Design a protein around this ligand. Structure first.
Ligand SMILES: Nc1nc2c(ncn2[C@@H]2O[C@H](COP(=O)(O)OP(=O)(O)O)[C@@H](O)[C@H]2O)c(=O)[nH]1
Ligand SMILES: Nc1nc2c(ncn2[C@@H]2O[C@H](COP(=O)(O)OP(=O)(O)O)[C@@H](O)[C@H]2O)c(=O)[nH]1
Ligand SMILES: Nc1nc2c(ncn2[C@@H]2O[C@H](COP(=O)(O)OP(=O)(O)O)[C@@H](O)[C@H]2O)c(=O)[nH]1
Ligand SMILES: Nc1nc2c(ncn2[C@@H]2O[C@H](COP(=O)(O)OP(=O)(O)O)[C@@H](O)[C@H]2O)c(=O)[nH]1
Lengths: 371, 371, 371, 371
């Protein structure tokens, strides 16, 4: 096979998560690209070298090295600091170094099986006729593949308009050609639900009981960047979107991977590729964060996501590869920003899509400079 | 007994809800005070007279009559228009006319039993040793008295900080003297949950299985104005709080009765009175409203309610009656507005408590002019 | 000569300004394009019909005829209603009809001479060696051509950073080739100063004493749309910028023509064309408006204008005509939106330039459709 | 006479202003109370110690000694840090220590004469029949007492609605009893104009030519805290108002002394006391700051000041001293906050007056504690 894998993780911690994460990555020979920030102490760099002495191919480029690379690519102001958006640096580096599979992870996620890297390499198997899962409402709930207490939940980024009628939706499985390029692994413990769901029922993912699915064309499901493998061809469309844009005066946050998960998904289906949900599963322990502050950060994006996803189905895309398709998607979002109507579509909400459109083309422009 | 009852309802509808609501009120001889607004058509007034010809003691004062009364009480700018805050006009009128019990209802609530008015008259029974319900965490979940699908929920206004540990709280029932002055009836169908809960699980109240409870001193539970009887002595502390105050730039709404339900509750316990939860139960059908807009309106209040309720337990109150105690509460909230700290306590959030403090004293001042 | 002139005016008034504006336009055979809005009464349409019978070639398309034209050009949402941005409709119509000169006016401006149209036809003279005016600081104060009391003033849109040192700048006149394509006529009575200047000194323009000037390459001066002729080739770059974008939460207004005046000016100098200031002079009487409300709307623009103009001098442009150069300018504004730094450059301020750039391309896309 | 004078200055500088300020204060035996902040370096404390050995009675309480004093007075959250509002600490300290005259100054002001302290002692002369200056429009322009180029200006805080017609107002001088308690010394160089005036004309005060005046009852003029003596009886009404309250989402600043100057002025005239303008004159050199940032902070104040001053003329006050009259003023401001109407009076603008009224009473409550 000779499939190369690079794991991208951004962090501002001391690096203690490497003690449990390294054995799963060192046995498979995959590279771990750790992207620190300006608010990251020197304990992380000392923890990376010690794990490298144990055999782990871990790279931790300092802030000066990251900024020097971004300035050499004419994008010095694209990726901000004091933000998890810096994982785009790891996406770029892993793509420059020619890795076949790029696995995006959070520093608080831990693999639960010994074949974590092997299962994520499913995005490099190629096209073949395989069981594909379709839904009559065009949406699939990946949380239905898990055993969740005390009630059924939806993943973060799932549109709220389609939730009440999703119970009556018909799910079909058919043998059809498909080419998996994005594999979204599931999570045990604290699932990836929005702040609205975590505040209401505080869900707990007990086990992974539904297996794995490959979504057919027209059936969507949000993809995060906490346990997701992306084939190197689809990485140009996996740019982690810049947050902070105000919606009716409230700065938007915590949805950078919601847009990127949908953007790489609509580009993949335009090119005849599919998204996979299921294994490998990680353990996401419950972190102690102000859930009311998470809600305050997620509401601005939630008010717009339903309309954005609705117009993306009506808008056809152009392109022969992910670079051309992602740039065609950026201009599509600018037409949507002026066509959409609603109470939450203030001038700053519309301009959010326009600024995001420029940053996405600035991302693709940087990838075209190295290539 | 000779107990007089007045039902206060504000509406902007055509008055079609009177066809089913009048029989429950006409048989008991209670008065129905309907408060229209400027955005209310002339069909409501024609529907009130026809139901009055059938025997219902229904009063529907026009906007000109309401404003003339408020200007005669030196409060012309207290109650705004195009808002459900106009139910304060019904509170004032029912209190001026000397009614013993004032039942606050929404126009979309319908009694389910033939003893609706009789059960709400429990607030005029007087003090007596009776089973009182206490909780080790100081909070009672009235939704636990209902059969709810698909999972357990909390009422709108219940603090989020105490929800995770509320399952391990110990509930006790003891024989203690108590004087019920506020009776919060429950609701079937769509329960009174916040927008966070309704978006996540979309609860459905099937039946009322837990009976009725009287909360002891120190055990709180939010009280709404959709199906709640208030003894005429406690009405001065039941002022429906003015909404629209921005919190970090976002106008607050949909929590006018959350503050009033807590304010009349903390005043009642200071004076040795209690709040009752249970019967009579009404049917609240599910209305078709933008749940994401409700969330946008409720988040500003939700970010502050936990801290406000926390400081109210530390702040002692003064007063011999509800007028003195409510005014003492207003000054207490101004001290809290400067002592509280947090990320959501911007200058406009603190000033919200100060403006609310003036409006509450303006409400008590109006009641002292008629009295 | 056989020069066709079209005057573009948008208004919501009754049309009384036609009585004093028609004689100067009817004696010259020019067309007046009146663009009404939704808040325009039916008395304006009757005013245009009477002056039509008096010999004035005046057209007044209803809002239904405006939206029909804008929809056929795939720009139904470009131009908003209840806004003076609707003068773009007159710009478009006059450009489709093939008029050589387009004179942009406000409805409260009145010509003071008989040769009003003849003087504005200077934009159709062609290139010739003529005295051009240059300034050592790169800025020219057109209000210095007027007699203003009680003190010297700068026009609306003049950068504030260059004002204190402008008195020390040297003004030189040289014989150089120039092609006048924009002619900004001056104004007596209430000059076109910003709300800051009008609140401080309330200037009064008494006379036009400085004659007329043609600015050399590198010397700029703001151009408004109240008394300005534009050659039809330069009209594609004269799109009246859409207002309402928030800057730190404050929506901007009253500066749509400030950007359009600078945008058509930087495009003209790139193509070797020049801007003229001086005659014909109009009379702008002191209007009736709250100056503090004008200030509240102009401050968000003023906070960004100096930085935008500074970066436009460094950013080179491309293009062979005004359509290509304007589109090149739009992409230049998006790069400036990410390189600029300052306390006023919040995320919404940067996104303002990105949304404006899309609307500029939407304007050029509509012109390329009729072409 | 045996008149004790205390000069109050808050600063974050190194203390170099002490070299040119001490001689005028040391030769008069006055005390200088320097109030540092958290962002004040250790070089200031060494500067006060050297001038202490040179004979200057200068005190410089550390932020630990400030918070200890403010906590014992039950006002630990009244005065914020990183703000020039900390000059209230100097007002409090000088009042506790029993000084007769309190001179409020900024650290960038320098006396121009030897009798600086002696002239400020005019607030301790007592009542006497003296020439008082009245104006037919109820406003006096103290900048008319100075020689200002290039044109006439109004002081910061002067209402904008009264400026255009002020030139037509009649100024009369009459022999009437008056008791000067506030003396606002004038300023040369950069006068105390608002950011609107400084941006438009950049005034320069060349000389003090108009002498000094004492304003009659009904004639007002804004008083700042940069060069102003306050009799100790009037200090309770001279509380420097806390800034930062949003007006339509924009936080206000730079107007803390504008309100305090008007508040102590309306309280003084209610008690039969007068305000004086003129000598002693200081030199305020042109500072180094972004004028557009000053404008951004002053506009929210300017939008409300005219309406606040208009209602203060109609609202009568009560009280026998400055403590009672200031508290009566605070409740008067809350009634104005609900009666006032206008486009700038959003809910947060009204709540600004309510929170300010509580802080005013918190200030008076602390003074009644030490008393
Ligand atoms: N570069 C960078 N990464 C961050 C920062 N904050 C968080 N992250 C990363 O973003 C991911 C999400 O973190 P967070 O939202 O705090 O997770 P939580 O603790 O479960 O709430 C984590 O895996 C972090 O490694 C930051 O300031 N800079
Ligand atoms: N006076 C007045 N009352 C209102 C207005 N809007 C709603 N209400 C009342 O407030 C209550 C709450 O209404 P609403 O929030 O719309 O209930 P929903 O339909 O279930 O969402 C209703 O019983 C209405 O009678 C209004 O504009 N003016
Ligand atoms: N279509 C349209 N035009 C407007 C509107 N308001 C103003 N205008 C036009 O825009 C120009 C500017 O007017 P205005 O803003 O009132 O200038 P002012 O004198 O400074 O107040 C006028 O000539 C009006 O004809 C509007 O709501 N719609
Ligand atoms: N305690 C404190 N005082 C300040 C601070 N900033 C300014 N001051 C004082 O407030 C006065 C006003 O200064 P400033 O706002 O810079 O005036 P400017 O010349 O118009 O810029 C000065 O005399 C300073 O000593 C601060 O952060 N803390």
């Amino acid at each position: 096979r000779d499939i190369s894998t690079a794991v991208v993780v951004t962090t501002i911690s001391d690096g203690g998560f490497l003690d449990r994460l390294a054995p799963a990555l060192r046995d498979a020979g995959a590279r771990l690209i750790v992207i620190p920030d300006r608010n990251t102490g020197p304990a992380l760099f000392a923890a990376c070298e010690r794990h490298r002495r144990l055999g782990l191919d871990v790279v931790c480029p300092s802030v000066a090295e990251q900024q020097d690379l971004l300035e050499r690519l004419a994008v010095p102001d694209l990726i901000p600091y004091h933000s998890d958006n810096r994982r785009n640096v790891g996406y770029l580096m892993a793509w420059m170094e020619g890795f076949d599979v790029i696995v995006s992870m959070d520093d608080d996620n831990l693999p639960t099986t010994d074949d974590f890297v092997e299962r994520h390499q499913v995005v490099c198997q190629g096209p073949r006729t395989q069981p594909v899962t379709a839904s009559s409402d065009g949406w699939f709930n990946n949380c239905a593949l898990l055993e969740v207490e005390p009630t059924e939940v939806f993943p973060r980024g799932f549109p709220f308009h389609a939730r009440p009628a999703h119970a009556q939706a018909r799910t079909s499985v058919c043998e059809r050609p498909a080419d998996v390029r994005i594999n979204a692994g599931l999570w045990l413990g604290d699932p990836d639900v929005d702040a609205i769901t975590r505040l209401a029922v505080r869900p707990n993912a007990l086990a992974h009981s539904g297996g794995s699915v490959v979504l057919a064309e027209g059936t969507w499901c949000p993809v995060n960047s906490q346990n997701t493998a992306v084939h190197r061809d689809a990485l140009p469309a996996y740019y982690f979107l810049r947050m902070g844009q105000p919606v009716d005066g409230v700065p938007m946050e915590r949805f950078g991977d919601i847009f990127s998960g949908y953007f790489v998904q609509v580009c993949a289906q335009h090119l005849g590729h599919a998204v996979r949900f299921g294994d490998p599963v990680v353990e996401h322990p419950r972190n102690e964060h102000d859930l009311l502050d998470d809600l305050h950060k997620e509401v601005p994006a939630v008010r717009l996501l339903d309309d954005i996803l609705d117009h993306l189905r009506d808008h056809p895309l152009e392109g022969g590869d992910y670079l051309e398709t992602y740039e065609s998607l950026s201009y599509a979002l600018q037409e949507i920003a002026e066509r959409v109507n609603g109470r939450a579509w203030s001038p700053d909400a519309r301009a959010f899509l326009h600024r995001s459109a420029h940053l996405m083309r600035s991302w693709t422009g940087a990838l075209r400079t190295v290539a």
